[PDB]
Design an enzyme around this catalytic site. Sequence first.
Site, PDB file in Angstrom:
ATOM      1  CG  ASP A   9      -1.808   1.217   1.191  1.00 19.68           C
ATOM      2  OD1 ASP A   9      -1.725   1.967   0.488  1.00 19.68           O
ATOM      3  OD2 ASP A   9      -2.339   1.041   2.286  1.00 19.68           O
ATOM      4  CE  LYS A  71      -2.242   6.876  -3.633  1.00 23.30           C
ATOM      5  NZ  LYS A  71      -2.580   5.990  -2.503  1.00 23.30           N
ATOM      6  CD  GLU A 176      -5.164   3.196  -2.801  1.00 23.35           C
ATOM      7  OE1 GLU A 176      -6.054   3.719  -2.677  1.00 23.35           O
ATOM      8  OE2 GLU A 176      -4.059   3.739  -3.021  1.00 23.35           O
ATOM      9  CG  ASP A 199      -9.755   4.372   1.643  1.00 26.09           C
ATOM     10  OD1 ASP A 199      -9.390   5.229   2.708  1.00 26.09           O
ATOM     11  OD2 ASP A 199      -9.028   4.030   0.921  1.00 26.09           O
TER      12      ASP A 199
END
Length: 381
Positions: A9, A71, A176, A199
């Site tokens: 991850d 990211k 993910e 999430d």
Amino acid sequence: DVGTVVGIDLGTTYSCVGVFKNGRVEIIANDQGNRITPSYVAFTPEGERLIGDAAKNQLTSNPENTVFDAKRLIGRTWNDPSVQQDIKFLPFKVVEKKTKPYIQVDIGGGQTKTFAPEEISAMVLTKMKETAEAYLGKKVTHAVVTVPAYFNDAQRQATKDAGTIAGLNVMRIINEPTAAAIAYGLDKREGEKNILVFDLGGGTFDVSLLTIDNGVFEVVATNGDTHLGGEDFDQRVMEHFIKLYKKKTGKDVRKDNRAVQKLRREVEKAKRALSSQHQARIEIESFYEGEDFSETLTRAKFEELNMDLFRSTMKPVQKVLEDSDLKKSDIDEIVLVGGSTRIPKIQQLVKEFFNGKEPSRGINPDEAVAYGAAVQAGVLS
Ligand SMILES: Nc1ncnc2c1nc(NCc1ccc3ccccc3n1)n2[C@@H]1O[C@H](CO)[C@@H](O)[C@H]1O
């Protein structure tokens, strides 16, 4: 040929590595004792490149040369609207170079270097890679890396290049919310089922609708808020107490920022306790002007302060069920991911939205995505 392959991850704020060993997924702790690592990189004035907890711990004294949130820039062009919004909130320098947003930093002694978003993430990945190799006693060469379900070709590819630079062959890129679904083995049943992954991480909120058909995952629709997460809730309580300081001491806290970062620390700590406790105490020695801070936060006050923010998390859940042409009755599994899903109000909210249905429980929500990846990595040797 591929050795032990690792599940990574590579998250916005945090990262996790897992491995499959003796019939079980092993989540690996870094050299600091931690099962998650900050996606952080920093260059001290001495010229010492620090990645991880070590970079996150010294960001107050080095705000220009502490790189985080890469990211948000990875696999994007300089002129991407999202990038030109993002760089406004990012205290290190981002320049246009080879069409891309390159991070510019001082490497030590005023010496300048630029790094592509992929080169920063490659540093983060190197740390995950050395984190894994210390547990295993051997070099690692191959990996399963995850991305959010919305990542496009260029974002997926640039994540593989971050990998390559780190000396990692990214054999697989998995979504993910899918890796999460795999962590709960939801891919180990016969059927056609709908899965809602909700999430809520440090600085992002993502809601994915997946369909599973005999181990075949499909992302149907995605939503969320790219700038909503646990840090936001920190800010709100930070605001509460700065405002309270003023009213008692007459003093104002943003005059020293080292006081503000101290509060940031003990707030984030208090919030986390409050998923488990009904009250927590925030204690700061030499908070401001040498004076000691001591206050408490009830869970009720915590909830009170973010109620509008917690509640906003349902609207993406609705837009997802719309775009997926499905009612509330159609969701067969609810998967919670991200450390912020440990917040009790968040759970109350999800559950009553879906008319009292209990979510999948059992895996650490910070680890669920590296877990999913490590499961797949396990198959790959
Ligand atoms: N129980 C918790 N309750 C509420 N929020 C929580 C939480 N655990 C984490 N995260 C896991 C975590 C993060 C740092 C830690 C540091 C020391 C000890 C345990 C820790 N655990 N978060 C939030 O997740 C976001 C992404 O992590 C951050 O906003 C964080 O607040």
